[PDB]
Design a binder for this molecule. Structure first.
Ligand SMILES: CC1=N[C@@H]2[C@@H](O)[C@H](O)[C@@H](CO)O[C@@H]2S1
Length: 640
């Protein structure tokens, strides 16, 4: 391939102390003058471990520059270094991207470096195996909580017609027709005497529906828009197309259906890598296919700010872009280009309208006071304290990325973001983040030192709560309830109205629910679509929780140990599944990580525990698979 190649090797592993060898090959014919290697690595390289040369790390962005000044043609450079971390189980744990800057007979140059797959020392031997499976006659995902199926069937064609006798169901019906068209080039038209009938039924509670196929008709009953949307999403899975006759076929059957959990979410990280309006919409559409109702928009982080804030235009003019010649350095991938994007308010209004039509509420996340590098680099005049010499390092290996809660500019900033955010997103909810604020922060900040004294705080976590409580008070004045990751509770300053997302595990969900907090369960051990799907080292993904095979994700039972009687269970809003995109930058990888485990997650959100069975779910998945092939969704194939 390239004339420049880097080989990385696990030399040795002693508990939490891994030594690597790095060999850089100048394969070409030229001597390389004053050169330097830059790559993307998500582990923190111990700076005093480096064997040979100068190495710099800013998050994932590393540069290696040799002690010497020339790399001879056909030779190479060698460097060793160590990290604290458990053994690498995956090729993904290696460098994601490498590139070289150099000079040749006097001329600056830049070239892509081939990155050889890391030579692993301790791959896994175990493999998750999925058994051979039948195709299920009704490949429905999530499994309806009641369904009776008859021996016969109702066949119908493009003149069958669609009847609607309540305006609650107008959105569902137009979503149904749209999807029949997009997925199947099957055009239904609306007629007063259609064989598909949307009628109202007020005994059915929110999101419940009834669907009955008979020899004459197909009837959809619900008391809510969302129940009509859910019914339509079952019907799209139920129908079976004959292209030779251009007919649809649905088994005669009776379905009565309702969700186990009110909160059935999916979060998408769009800060680490930007995804297009069309990709985001395409996802939201696929979310309503499985009857989820919440799209949690992670729009802000250290490596990107993706939501336009008219009153703070720097946040996108600067924070939406990173790379060598930008204010923000390259991160994770696209080392050689200017990389980014962002959503305008008009785009966002469009995505909201699109998702409303699908029964999906969108919750924006403005992540503070950690994970703020992009905001801080965009707005240094409001968010930097020049006099702070606290030396800290975050989980992602930044030391300059945390909001200062004693700076009046930090309140200027958040008051302005939240006002526009609140105005923009109709949902009565704003997620404030609050994850992974490093332990050392603010300890040497004069301004924080003075505010710590001024109101008698004894812990610097108390300063974080002070800020989040201000965010909550502003959100409340704007009509929004605040949501937060579990660490928002740190400092015990935020009110019992803050909805706690439990992600490290289910522990905070349990603890916080006992104390009167409403919680959402997003445990990393069972709900993170960025985790690898198998133990084979070729599986893309990360693994800090644990590998998450399909069967693990399916068999997740939320708070499996709180008895169903327990009034703790009244504080569970529901479940969320998340995709963080550190190593995800293209729709093909996205689809692979999300599907199919998302459908196992939608079934935990929706179906009652007593109707959930692994073997049964695999046969419904096997019969759904073709429907994702028709949509060109690049799911990881259970059976390959
Ligand atoms: C809350 C969370 N903040 C971290 C995120 O910034 C990372 O992307 C994710 C990767 O799994 O780990 C947790 S979850």
């Amino acid at each position: 391939g390239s004339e420049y190649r880097v080989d990385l090797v696990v030399l040795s592993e002693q508990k939490q102390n891994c030594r690597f060898g790095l060999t850089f090959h100048n394969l070409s014919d030229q001597d390389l003058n004053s050169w330097g290697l830059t790559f993307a690595f998500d582990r923190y390289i111990l700076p005093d471990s480096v064997s040979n040369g100068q190495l710099t790390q800013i998050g994932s962005f590393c540069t290696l520059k040799p002690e010497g000044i020339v790399l001879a043609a056909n030779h190479h450079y060698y460097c060793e270094f160590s990290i604290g971390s458990n053994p690498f189980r995956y090729y993904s744990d290696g460098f994601n991207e490498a590139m070289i800057d150099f000079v040749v007979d006097g001329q600056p140059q830049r070239a892509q470096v081939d990155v050889t797959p890391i030579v692993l020392a301790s791959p896994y031997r175990e493999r998750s195996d999925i058994p051979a499976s039948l195709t299920h006659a009704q490949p429905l995902l999530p499994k309806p909580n009641h369904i009776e199926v008859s021996d016969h069937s109702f066949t119908f064609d493009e003149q069958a017609g669609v009847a609607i006798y309540t305006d609650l169901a107008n959105s569902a019906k137009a979503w149904l027709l749209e999807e029949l068209q997009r997925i199947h080039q099957f055009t239904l038209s609306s007629s007063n005497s259609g064989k598909i009938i949307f009628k109202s039924n007020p005994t059915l509670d929110e999101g419940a529906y009834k669907l009955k196929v008979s020899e004459e008709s197909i009837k959809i009953e619900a008391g809510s828009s969302s129940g009509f949307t859910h019914a339509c999403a079952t019907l799209l899975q139920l129908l079976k197309r004959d292209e030779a006759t251009k007919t649809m076929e649905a088994v005669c059957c009776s379905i009565i259906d309702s969700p186990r959990f009110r909160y059935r979410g999916m979060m998408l990280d769009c800060a680490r890598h930007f995804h297009s309006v069309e990709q985001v919409k395409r996802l939201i559409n696929l979310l309503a296919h499985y009857k989820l109702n919440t799209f949690h928009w992670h729009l802000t982080d250290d490596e990107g700010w993706r939501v336009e804030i008219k009153s703070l235009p720097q946040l996108t003019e600067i924070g939406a872009w990173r790379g060598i010649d930008e204010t923000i350095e390259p991160q994770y991938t696209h080392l050689s280009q200017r990389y980014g994007g962002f959503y305008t308010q008009e785009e966002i209004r469009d995505v909201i309208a699109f998702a409303e039509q699908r029964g999906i509420t969108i919750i924006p996340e403005i992540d503070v006071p950690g994970h703020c590098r992009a905001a801080i680099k965009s707005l240094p005049h409001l968010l930097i304290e020049a006099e702070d010499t606290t030396e800290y390092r975050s989980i992602q290996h930044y030391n300059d990325n945390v909001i200062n809660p004693a700076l009046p500019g930090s309140y200027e900033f958040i008051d302005k973001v939240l006002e526009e955010i609140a105005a923009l997103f109709p949902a009565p909810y704003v997620h404030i983040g609050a994850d992974e604020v490093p332990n050392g922060v603010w300890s040497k900040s004069p301004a924080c030192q003075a505010l710590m004294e001024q109101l008698g705080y004894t812990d610097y976590k108390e300063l974080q709560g002070h800020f989040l409580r201000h965010a909550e008070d502003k959100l409340r004045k704007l009509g929004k309830r605040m949501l937060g990751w579990e660490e928002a509770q740190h400092g015990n300053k935020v009110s019992k109205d803050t909805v706690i997302y439990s992600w490290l595990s289910e522990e905070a969900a349990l603890n916080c629910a006992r104390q009167g907090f409403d919680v959402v369960l997003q445990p990393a051990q069972t709900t993170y679509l960025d985790m690898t799907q198998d133990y084979a080292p070729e599986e893309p993904g990360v693994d800090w929780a644990n590998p998450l095979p399909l069967e693990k994700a399916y068999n997740y039972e939320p708070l499996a140990e709180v008895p169903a009687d327990d009034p703790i269970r009244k504080r569970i809003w529901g479940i969320q599944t998340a995709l963080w995109c550190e190593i995800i930058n293209n729709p093909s990888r996205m689809d692979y990580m999300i599907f199919p485990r998302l459908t196992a997650m939608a079934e935990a959100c929706w179906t009652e525990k007593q109707h959930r069975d692994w073997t049964d779910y695999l046969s419904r998945l096997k019969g759904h698979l073709p429907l994702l092939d028709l949509q060109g969704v690049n799911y990881r194939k259970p059976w390959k």
